[PDB]
Amino acid sequence: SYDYEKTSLTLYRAVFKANYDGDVGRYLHPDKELAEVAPLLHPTFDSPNTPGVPARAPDIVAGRDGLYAPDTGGTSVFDRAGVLRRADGDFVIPDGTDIPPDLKVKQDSYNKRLQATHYTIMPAKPMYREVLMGQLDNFVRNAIRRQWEKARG
Amino acid sequence: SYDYEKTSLTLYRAVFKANYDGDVGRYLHPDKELAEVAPLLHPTFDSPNTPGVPARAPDIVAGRDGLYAPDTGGTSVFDRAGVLRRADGDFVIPDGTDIPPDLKVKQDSYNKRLQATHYTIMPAKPMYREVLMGQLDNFVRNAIRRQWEKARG
Amino acid sequence: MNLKPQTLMVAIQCVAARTRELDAQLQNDDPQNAAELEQLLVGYDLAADDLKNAYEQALGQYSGLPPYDRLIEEP
Amino acid sequence: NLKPQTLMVAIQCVAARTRELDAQLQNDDPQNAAELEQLLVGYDLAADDLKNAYEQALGQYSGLPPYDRLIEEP
Known part of the structure; x- marks a missing residue:
């Protein structure tokens, strides 16, 4: 299953504050931070060459043409909080959040070790990196709007 | 690179006497011995279901139809002796051995951990198990014949 | 290319086994880059699912292959 | 088709289990050494296919690490 318009379920993205160039604590219980935004739902695009440390597989990978096609990885989220125990917290994508037009959210399997179902935010059509990043930024903003709508009932 | 008529290199098959019902010590240094023959170049076809012990992958695997096709595994041999230190010895396939008509022998890669080049004896066309086993038996017999021809110069 | 089915068996077993081993370290040995390792194991699980x-x-x-659930059984 | 990230992981894990278990084979006295030695021949064939x-x-694909980096002894 893939979702295309609105999410039907609350999804959570682990936030490791160390990964960001600036403070992202603001995003754990956010205010009006849909007006620049931290790249919270950006997937890794590479594996850096760190000697001694085995290569990290990129979350998503482009074709030789530079285009990121569907089902070739994406950004990981789960259907409950705290799945990653060593994170600083979870950025919340509430049920009912608008999915940017060229992205989709794929339900993958239930993971027994983590006791949570994994999901992948991915491109719905082939796109260059910049376009994908752009949509993922709008996805963050939609999620924040939707947090406040939910709070006002 | 495949061989189809005669082997161009001496190849060695590790013999684990535990894998056989008969005594196979006779085959390490054999006098002319086309007689029933021990299945020395037979690949494993299944992984026995022994509980607790993780499954051993089969050397070769058939399609749904029961046919063993080329390039789907086969019997492992190497280009020097004593590659497998825990074996009881090596059955020798001398350079110049006749290859049964529907088999072939494939050169695979050099293995760095074992410091030897691996080769696979394989079907040249799709065949049922009995036919394959039959040809592998004739391959043993050809190898023995060729051991005596080599000995008489 | 399609990997041969024996190759898939091996990869499934090795992935399962490294995942158990690194999950046990993560929880019992207080390793130096715990946070990076935890994320690595998410990546291992996704690969496991694709396999x-x-x-x-x-x-x-193919015939004669062991069922999936036997391959990832704890030995 | 497998994702390329899946192949990377499978290569790394195969390499790593092969080392750990080759080391046991040679240093320890594991309960079925002869079965284990054959198993490792199977692991190496799988490694080559991967x-x-x-x-x-x-x-x-672009942006993938080269093969020889993946199997590096860390």
Whole structure:
């Protein structure tokens, strides 16, 4: 299953504050931070060459043409909080959040070790990196709007 | 690179006497011995279901139809002796051995951990198990014949 | 290319086994880059799932293969 | 088709289990040494098949690490 318009379920993205160039604590219980935004739902695009440390597989990978096609990885989220125990917290994508037009959210399997179902935010059509990043930024903003709508009932 | 008529290199098959019902010590240094023959170049076809012990992958695997096709595994041999230190010895396939008509022998890669080049004896066309086993038996017999021809110069 | 089905079996077993080993370290040995390792294991699980769908497909094309659930059994 | 990230992981895990278990084979007295030695021949064949597939994926995707980095002893 893939979702295309609105999410039907609350999804959570682990936030490791160390990964960001600036403070992202603001995003754990956010205010009006849909007006620049931290790249919270950006997937890794590479594996850096760190000697001694085995290569990290990129979350998503482009074709030789530079285009990121569907089902070739994406950004990981789960259907409950705290799945990653060593994170600083979870950025919340509430049920009912608008999915940017060229992205989709794929339900993958239930993971027994983590006791949570994994999901992948991915491109719905082939796109260059910049376009994908752009949509993922709008996805963050939609999620924040939707947090406040939910709070006002 | 495949061989189809005669082997161009001496190849060695590790013999684990535990894998056989008969005594196979006779085959390490054999006098002319086309007689029933021990299945020395037979690949494993299944992984026995022994509980607790993780499954051993089969050397070769058939399609749904029961046919063993080329390039789907086969019997492992190497280009020097004593590659497998825990074996009881090596059955020798001398350079110049006749290859049964529907088999072939494939050169695979050099293995760095074992410091030897691996080769696979394989079907040249799709065949049922009995036919394959039959040809592998004739391959043993050809190898023995060729051991005596080599000995008489 | 399609990997041979024996190759899938091996990869499934090794992935399962490294995942158990590194999950046990993560929880019992207080390793130096715990946070990076935890994320790595998410990546291992995703790969495990992709290997599993491929092996379900191989189960329909070959005979004599062990069922998936036997391959990832704790020994 | 497997994702290329799946091939990377499978290569790394195969390499790593092969080392750990080759080391046992040679240093320890594991309960079925002779079965284990054969198992490792099977692991190496699988390793090679994963490598051919990865060489292919290197021709179709960008930003993947080279094969020899993946199997590096860390």
